[PDB]
Amino acid sequence: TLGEKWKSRLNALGKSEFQIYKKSGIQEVDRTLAKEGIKRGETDHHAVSRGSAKLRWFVERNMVTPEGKVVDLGCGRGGWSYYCGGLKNVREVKGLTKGGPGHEEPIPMSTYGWNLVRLQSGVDVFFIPPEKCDTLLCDIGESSPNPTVEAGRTLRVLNLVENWLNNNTQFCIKVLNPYMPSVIEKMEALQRKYGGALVRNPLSRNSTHEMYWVSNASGNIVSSVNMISRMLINRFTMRYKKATYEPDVDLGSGTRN
């Protein structure tokens, strides 16, 4: 497929060439100071990761309207959870991850609405009973040189999420590899059953073909992905181009009643 061609080409790049391509013409969050602040123990204002700004991109465009009880599957440090904790119609946020050595452990913060957020690692979302929620978030998906490996991992995530959804469910779910036939088929059925569409976030690096399945979006799946495969391929042709930066998000401080 067109995406697989992109994948072959990506795997043939040298080290230096990869790092450059990875950032060419993408959008980037200015994280220097937020990171230095967290390192000094600062728990107010800062986003634990660039995932906050990433999720904000979708939310400010109403592609996902987090509300009620939010479940963040694979929350990592908590970037997505903490951001939702400060959102108007959100009442509760539950984030889950593996954590442990060689894995991202959630960081305790005092950002706005932190008291509405509960994080816990040592949990493998794939084998715990599904819970009820109003919005389901999931940013799971480890990339690999081999697209068939990504296809399976992706299909696992899609089936995992299919269990946590009902209808009225707001959702933003990462789809690591959306171009492999197997994943495309699944997405067509899921779209057919739960709506929404796939969207490319300008903050995603060129090194990944990741797209997110957002509930409040529309668009033909096959058409979605290809449009993006062509983009990523075109970006290979770029010379001496870097990312455009933007200020990170300020998450406030304070509790919510």
Ligand SMILES: Nc1ncnc2c1ncn2[C@@H]1O[C@H](CSCC[C@H](N)C(=O)O)[C@@H](O)[C@H]1O
């Ligand atoms: N089976 C599983 N169960 C729980 N967590 C998992 C998992 N597989 C992967 N993960 C976690 O999924 C996380 C995805 S990266 C998290 C980004 C987060 N949205 C943020 O903005 O900070 C990784 O940290 C990984 O540790």
